[PDB]
């Protein structure tokens, strides 16, 4: 079973270096990217390596 | 300089064990809780220990 799937909530690293919370809309295993929809309903392609369904709370 | 402040975006651990993204609306240093507003505009008091401005991506 895959780590990432449609409808899953994830954190995604954005180009500003920050983590935003979104939902996976499409998974592309050939390119290892997902289409992620964010809270403003924007949708962008994000590499699997920058998507995480889970996180460890902490300090920078 | 405090770790948490009004207007800050944070993850907060909910009673279901999951992390939700919200915004600090009030900081109470005597009780070490914050009033956190969530994406559905609900507001709850959360202990400082269960609030984090940062997260490390990771697997369960």
């Amino acid at each position: 079973r895959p780590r990432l799937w449609e409808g899953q909530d994830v954190l995604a690293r954005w180009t500003d270096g920050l983590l935003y919370l979104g939902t996976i809309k499409k998974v592309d295993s050939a390119r290892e990217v997902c289409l992620v929809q964010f809270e403003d309903d924007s949708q962008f392609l994000v590499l699997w390596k920058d998507i995480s369904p889970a996180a460890l709370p902490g300090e920078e | 300089r405090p770790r948490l402040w009004e207007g800050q975006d944070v993850l907060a651990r909910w009673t279901d064990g999951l992390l939700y993204l919200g915004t600090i609306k009030k900081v109470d240093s005597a009780r070490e809780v914050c009033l956190v507003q969530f994406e559905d505009d609900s507001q709850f008091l959360v202990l400082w220990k269960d609030i984090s401005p940062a997260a490390l991506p990771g697997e369960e």
């Binding site: 500003d16 983590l19 964010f38 403003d40 | 993204l21 915004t23 401005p53 940062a54």
Partner: peptide, 8 residues
């Protein structure tokens, strides 16, 4: 750890 953010 990385700071989290909401869309502005």
């Amino acid at each position: 750890a990385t700071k989290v953010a909401r869309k502005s």
